[PDB]
Write a protein that binds this ligand. Sequence first.
Ligand code: HEM
Lengths: 497, 498, 498, 497
Amino acid sequence: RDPASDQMQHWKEQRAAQKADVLTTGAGNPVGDKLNVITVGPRGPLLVQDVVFTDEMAHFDRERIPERVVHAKGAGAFGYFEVTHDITKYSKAKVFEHIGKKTPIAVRFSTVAGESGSADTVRDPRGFAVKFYTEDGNWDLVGNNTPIFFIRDPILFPSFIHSQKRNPQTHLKDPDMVWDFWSLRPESLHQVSFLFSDRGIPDGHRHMNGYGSHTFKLVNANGEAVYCKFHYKTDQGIKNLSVEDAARLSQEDPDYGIRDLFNAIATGKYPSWTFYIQVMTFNQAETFPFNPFDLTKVWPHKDYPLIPVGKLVLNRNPVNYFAEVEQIAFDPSNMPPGIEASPDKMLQGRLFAYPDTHRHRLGPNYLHIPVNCPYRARVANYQRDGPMCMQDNQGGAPNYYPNSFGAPEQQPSALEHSIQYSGEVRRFNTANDDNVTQVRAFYVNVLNEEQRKRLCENIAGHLKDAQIFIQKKAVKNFTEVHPDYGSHIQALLDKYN
Amino acid sequence: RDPASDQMQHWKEQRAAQKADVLTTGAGNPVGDKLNVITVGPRGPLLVQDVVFTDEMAHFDRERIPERVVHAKGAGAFGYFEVTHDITKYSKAKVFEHIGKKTPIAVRFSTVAGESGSADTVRDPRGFAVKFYTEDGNWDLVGNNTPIFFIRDPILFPSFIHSQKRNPQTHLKDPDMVWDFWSLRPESLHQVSFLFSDRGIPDGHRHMNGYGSHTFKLVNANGEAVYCKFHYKTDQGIKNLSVEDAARLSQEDPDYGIRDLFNAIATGKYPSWTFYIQVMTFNQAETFPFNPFDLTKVWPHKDYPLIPVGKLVLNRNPVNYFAEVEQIAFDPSNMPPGIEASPDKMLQGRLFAYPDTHRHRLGPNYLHIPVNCPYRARVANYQRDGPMCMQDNQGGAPNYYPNSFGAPEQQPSALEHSIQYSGEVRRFNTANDDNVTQVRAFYVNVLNEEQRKRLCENIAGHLKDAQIFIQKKAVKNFTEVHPDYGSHIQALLDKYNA
Amino acid sequence: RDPASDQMQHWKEQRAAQKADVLTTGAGNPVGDKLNVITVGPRGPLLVQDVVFTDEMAHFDRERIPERVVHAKGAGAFGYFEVTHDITKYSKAKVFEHIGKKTPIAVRFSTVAGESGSADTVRDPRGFAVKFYTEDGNWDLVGNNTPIFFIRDPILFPSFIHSQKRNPQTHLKDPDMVWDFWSLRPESLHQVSFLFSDRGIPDGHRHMNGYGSHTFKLVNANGEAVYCKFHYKTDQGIKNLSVEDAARLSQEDPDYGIRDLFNAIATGKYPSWTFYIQVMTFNQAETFPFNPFDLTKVWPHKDYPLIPVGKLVLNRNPVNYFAEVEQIAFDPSNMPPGIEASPDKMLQGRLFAYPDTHRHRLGPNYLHIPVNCPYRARVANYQRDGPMCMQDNQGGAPNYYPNSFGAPEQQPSALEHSIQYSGEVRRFNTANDDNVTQVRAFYVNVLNEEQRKRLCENIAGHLKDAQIFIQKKAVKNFTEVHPDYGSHIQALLDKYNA
Amino acid sequence: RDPASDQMQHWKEQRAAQKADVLTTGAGNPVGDKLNVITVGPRGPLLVQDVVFTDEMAHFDRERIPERVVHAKGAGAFGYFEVTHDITKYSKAKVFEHIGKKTPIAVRFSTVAGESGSADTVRDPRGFAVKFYTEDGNWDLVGNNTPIFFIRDPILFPSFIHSQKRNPQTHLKDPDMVWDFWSLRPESLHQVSFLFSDRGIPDGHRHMNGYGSHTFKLVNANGEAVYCKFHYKTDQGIKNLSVEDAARLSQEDPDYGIRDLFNAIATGKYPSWTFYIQVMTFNQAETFPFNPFDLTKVWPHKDYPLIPVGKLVLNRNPVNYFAEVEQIAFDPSNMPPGIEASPDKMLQGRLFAYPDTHRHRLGPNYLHIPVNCPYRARVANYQRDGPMCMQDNQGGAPNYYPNSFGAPEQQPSALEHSIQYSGEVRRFNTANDDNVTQVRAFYVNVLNEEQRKRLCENIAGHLKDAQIFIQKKAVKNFTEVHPDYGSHIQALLDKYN
Ligand code: HEM
């Protein structure tokens, strides 16, 4: 059968010659019998001194860790990034230092709202997270399959996640929550139009693009800084699943994406993505018609063309899923010198959110789980102890800074880039920014007639389950985007109602 | 629109008169604005001073707790147990003390292998766990929808659970693991025959029976002990979903059971169960043809009739799912005086397994989560502290026993019943016990022709995905049960393999 | 016998009439016998079904939580704050709203570096943390017994804490670490001079002052803001322990402060503190000779007089130490409307550091441990779940914002005060700020001859154990403060080294 | 200066030639400046963008783990055990398999009741825990400096521990609790007499003996079983501190034992212990005048002589205290084939108590913290996942047993020895066992006049702080042991009162 079906057979075939290992306890003590327990006679009660049973049973009882608060259902793979073009005039990061340089990568794909156990082929944004193991530490590009997101302020993210998830009382998916949140926040129209198009259900993880979706800052060796976007487009082509096909697959094969990626890598059909950047100077960031740090906007390709950088290749399947996929952690704040953060508020909130959730989910010392370790860099600092400190704890080195005993020193060349900001320190309302121009451009100029009609059908078929007043508010926003948009959606809703 | 769809509308309607509450932080400080963050200028970076954002963000980051290692996907409800018949001659537990007395209950239904997010209408055993809030402490009857289980020794339970879950490398369901484990352990044939019949997919949680699968010990006020089984049959009738209907429902409505139970309770259609016991004397346990403490065997009804006890009724929906259903914990060791454990090895392992996993999953002080608290009895002991110690940590009372300062004292009437056992202390092999007699009885006498044909078709349609040698071993076990069983399964496998 | 010695006798005396409680398990099941375990025969092995022993033992195995990373050794008490003067022109916080208003408080005193188990009467700064339970949420004033601290940048705090604690290899106190850090960072001279004076060892917790030590921002109802300091001076008088007396007490009574506070409150001798503020306008902050947000500086009293505000009274002893003292958590970010943070970098770091460490030490839901709960305010937000959720989890209320179903709304009057800042966003060096002027003022004008000579003796007696080059660097800093300071310390060091 | 105080100087001297390391974050990213934070101008507020500060600060905030519920204050060392005599007729354990074989060991010394920060030189029992790294798994001999203990039933251990610690309200040491518990349970008289003698305060950890204190079962290769006791006597000699000297040292040097052990090993003065066993046949365990599995009784030397086995030597100091001493865990259930548990009820309770508390204190995967790992054995079983799994999660091997794919198998030779027991299954009262015979033997025949007088003075000076009726009950128990004992204690109490 398929290589995923033959995992145990393949393992047995590689271990055909050798004799089976001796079964031991967690402390290495050999086990005499692990099929029966110690009782007082044949029909008597169990004994405490059966420590083999207790040792196995307690560890079984402690197997689960909390799942991710979002993107719980996921698939992992490994490979490398290779440089194909020179962009050293924009960035001085070691990952781009010369043409042909290779950096090992780790990649996790995921959905957003479904828990670990839900189906892969549902309408949802897709996570595309890449971990670069560079000599200047780990670089995490925690991206999506869309260049934009629903909201533009990080304080609304927990509310959006709650509204996309189950009702707090009935534990059911509630369209009222979803559509009340979306109609009260019309800045989500762009990503809603993206989500309900054909690209909302990709045909596996190999047939979709990846976007960092934030503005980032590139600094070169001379100290000059530019703003950038990150793109990586699939070399396999964009492929999508129809609504009926996805509905069938969700029942027949709830793990469609995992099986597809594993069977592709196992047969040597390695998927690749071509890595691009967009570049915006500060002067033309001043004159951009929108806010260039707004997560609901893209940079048009005519004014900001793609610049090739390299390519991402995935050629290795995980050996153990729990150790390499479930325990992997991506922190957007993991940036080497040459890559920095832009003043995008969403990115600013993400700078705190991810290590904070990783400490809770995995542990304070999660950075030295082997899949998360920066094994191509040298870690030396004044941090000590913590639960599950699996090292020499940096030995007997001095643990305070500054000192006069030869402990590690700071590197002045790794200093951040300086920007002067104007304005007072307060909360600025961004709910009334431009919400319809790029949505109108997508509706009129990007989609053709059939894609547009399918998008309207999908929106109506999801929105018809909500209350009437939420329907009117959503239709009002859609009519603000385009009158035909709202009118078609309202006609389909009238048919449903 | 069903009442489940109108949850927010109903909540808004009960609060029509009142003005909305003031939005505060976790420390109660009122919040000025929670739609925008604090930046230096309109297009500047974020400030640490925005403690409102950090306070909400970290709590959102800490929302998830580890799911149950088994029975992760579940549905909760609440109600009461009522006594309708007198069994005081068998047990002295306060829950059965007189006819007509009521005890509040909490119930969780669940599947077994699927995690959170998996579908409800799949072929699986169903959990039926009942928590009695009794004045003599909490009593947990952690039952299933089948009277039997796959294995009879508790040390094989982690291996069986692993074999029914995802492959450790590919993270996929692996028929090889499932059927290799089942063919290497032929004592699972009885529960496999149960599982692949029509009752493997119940039509919601209201149309299925509940069984305390282990044998238990009942002690009366005179110190006499008997062995017992627990049954509670649905008053709604047994109803099952066909394979095609369940397949359609799994993708159309993955939360079919939760919605069904909630909409039943919300409309006033309260599901009910009739509570029964089987009773075996110790002489009858000596003369029983099998081991009476074997989890792969039942007590036949013609020799051990059902004795009515009471009624289980569920009439209240959960108010908050996470606090009442996700955080509820059932410990089989929670037994009041009058109810004890039998020497069933599975039950003995479960006596340790559940509080240990509860301490891991919820916390050391999980017993004082409000849904888990024994609020109808009085807690007084010499246990102190631990993480999240609420109330007053039993005040300044003496924390050592014995003492001379009026601290709580042991109650001699609550002493366990004493039994003399014979034999050596070692591991006794039970893999070669009788594995086919009751399976043959179920195959020949219980099922009719159509149910038998569907059972064979289901078994073949699952086993076809396994390797050839595992197929032959499983067919050998089925032929050991009955020649026609194995012959039909092999013929269907031959059709599938070509 | 003191009342602390008679705790158990008193508890027995209040329970003279009533009969002792029944000893139960954690689930409320009555215990037959808790002095012997279940064995097969008198000389046989232990049984799993002895669940009483397992429950008690497993709970005993989990009663330790991690201690505080600093201020581990501490003492707690409770009382109230009362307003005696009108400061409504400066702040609109409800805690100061009218004269005579009372607010319940909780107070923890502590040392800094010693772990839970170390002695009380050692040379160290003392923590003085006050938690106000106001109707606008909880307000925590996490203060010290000194108005200043050793460093002025929050990124050096873990290094300073490590240097004051045990060596990473030998696990011993290492004067090399302490004095190398202090000599490499000359900004610590002011707080070092404070620490090695007579007030470095107070005579219990009732004979010492308390300082917020940070500049804070007070905003009134009209939107005008001022900068403020917080003071609360002991009404019992400043009293200190000599070096020899403290050394004797450390081994004779390692819990001197706890016993002193408990016996004071138990006999009705309630300690009191008078609450003051200093007020700086923004123009005065512009014209201040130093940085007014520097943690190594004080505001001189002749230019910024004390303004009386209120009264802190402690009159209730803790009932259970672990529940009310070990589990209490103070967050400087807990500020009601009318009180805000200043741009002091140390305060900015603390704003993140304290809830972050509370989530790890106590749990994500630590704010609803009863001693930490804002029980005089109404908590309503969109935060849900988390481990050990011990309420209705806010029921079935909508959990997203904004919504259209009557869920809690933001309060616009609780918005923060707005300030425009100038300059680039980068790291600014503050190591070369003024380090010796206020230290010289303290050395020359505050201390008399005997206090000065004792201070020099204490400094030399601690610094003698360090290496020679660190001794020269420290002596160089002391000579920078004053030539006689450094010369006296060097002469005493010369005597010690020979 | 002692070598302990020159730790940083020594580290700097071994790192004199090399250049200092570059200071990085936990993810390996080089740090530009770690002395100042990022603010909005010289006097502005702090930025979230300062991820270096947050990364260091959160880890500092997560440094502490819960201390041990008992024996919190401790000192660690490392070395080896060597076989000097042949006892293979009693045991088939690989650790004793031939003369001259070495096995690496890890040792922790500790007090009992004091927490971290408390003084070393106080009157208390001393823990002497030895971890053998054996090719048949790890063997932990969790011993004490006394052959006996206060109680004989494991269900009273939490009550005794609570009574020896702080009052639940005042958080102070309460003599009422201690002496009420001791007078209500007169089986503690033997260990109380031991504790209040001169050996209650050892002169460091090198001048004291070690005892397993339990009866254990030794099984040879032919299946024959015997009962045994474990002894290891100090080759440095028994040395004790006087009450006044210990009181002075507690104030002056609260870490006297740690410094003494470290400076002994650092200067090459390696402490050693001689390893002995007592042997009781199953026939003569029936005719023993007491219960041979009673923790309040010893086996007399004239009837059960010591049999030499080997030497315990400590020659290596810890490199990092937290990783090697604070995180080390000893499980009495860690026993290789050839060593088993006896029906001692205290040992049976300890079989459950220690792994249960280790899972809470350190983590579910505490057995693979490097100091706890059985690195000289091969670990292979069907346990998977759990928090903080750091090696491979045993790869893609089959995780269920039995299987048909070559996974590890049980070893029938490692089966336990089987014993038939008689009697009912219930709770048997052991409070009325013999409580005074061996105490009387110790009082009359072991101690001389001066030691006896000092013991009486110490007991009186501790008991005078308790209430009067507790004093009478304790005096009644002491008079039961010997009339002169109780009369002297009562006269001293009368002087105090
Ligand atoms: C029923 C009786 C006992 C129980 C339940 C018990 C329980 C415990 C527990 C929970 C710990 C904490 C371990 C850790 O957190 O690392 C501990 C430590 C310890 N116990 Fe016991 N104990 C008992 C009696 C004894 C006896 C009889 C001995 C010696 C003969 C002993 C010697 C020790 C030692 C040396 C340690 C420190 C181990 C280390 O250095 O990590 N205990 N005990």
